[PDB]
């Protein structure tokens, strides 16, 4: 997960980032993944679901 910025808000998103990747890959609703990812506060998601530079 990117430092400084908000990509967790308390809970790690890296381990979950795999879910987003797998889902978004096949074509699954990422926002739904966000629910699974477990990223408190949308302040992170809003940046993730859009950017979330997984590369
Ligand atoms: Zn946050």
Swiss-Prot record:
Entries under HAMAP family matching the protein: RNApol_arch_Rpo10 (MF_00250)
Functional description taken from the UniProt entry: DNA-dependent RNA polymerase (RNAP) catalyzes the transcription of DNA into RNA using the four ribonucleoside triphosphates as substrates.
Residue numbers binding Zn(2+): 6, 9, 43-44
The reaction(s) this protein catalyses: RNA(n) + a ribonucleoside 5'-triphosphate = RNA(n+1) + diphosphate
A GO biological-process term: DNA-templated transcription
NCBIfam families noted in UniProt: PRK04016.1 (NF003089)
Family: Belongs to the archaeal Rpo10/eukaryotic RPB10 RNA polymerase subunit family.
EC category name: transferase
The record's free-text note on cofactor binding: Binds 1 zinc ion.
Origin species: Methanothermobacter thermautotrophicus (strain ATCC 29096 / DSM 1053 / JCM 10044 / NBRC 100330 / Delta H)
Cofactor: Zn(2+)
Keyword Cell membrane set for record: no
Annotated EC: 2.7.7.6
One Gene Ontology molecular-function label: DNA-directed RNA polymerase activity
Subcellular localization: Cytoplasm
Name by which UniProt lists this protein: DNA-directed RNA polymerase subunit Rpo10
GO cellular component: cytoplasm; DNA-directed RNA polymerase complex
InterPro entries, alphabetized: RNA_pol_su_RPB10 (IPR023580), RNA_pol_suN_Zn-BS (IPR020789), RPABC5/Rpb10 (IPR000268)
Record flagged with keyword Zinc: yes
Subunit structure: Part of the RNA polymerase complex.
Keywords carried by this UniProt record: Cytoplasm, DNA-directed RNA polymerase, Metal-binding, Nucleotidyltransferase, Transcription, Transferase, Zinc
Gene: rpo10
């Amino acid at each position: 997960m990117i430092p400084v910025r908000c990509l967790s808000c308390g809970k790690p998103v890296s381990a979950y980032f795999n879910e987003y990747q797998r889902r978004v890959a096949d074509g699954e609703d990422p926002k739904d993944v966000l629910d699974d990812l477990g990223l408190k506060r949308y302040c992170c998601r809003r940046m993730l679901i859009s950017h979330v530079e997984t590369w």
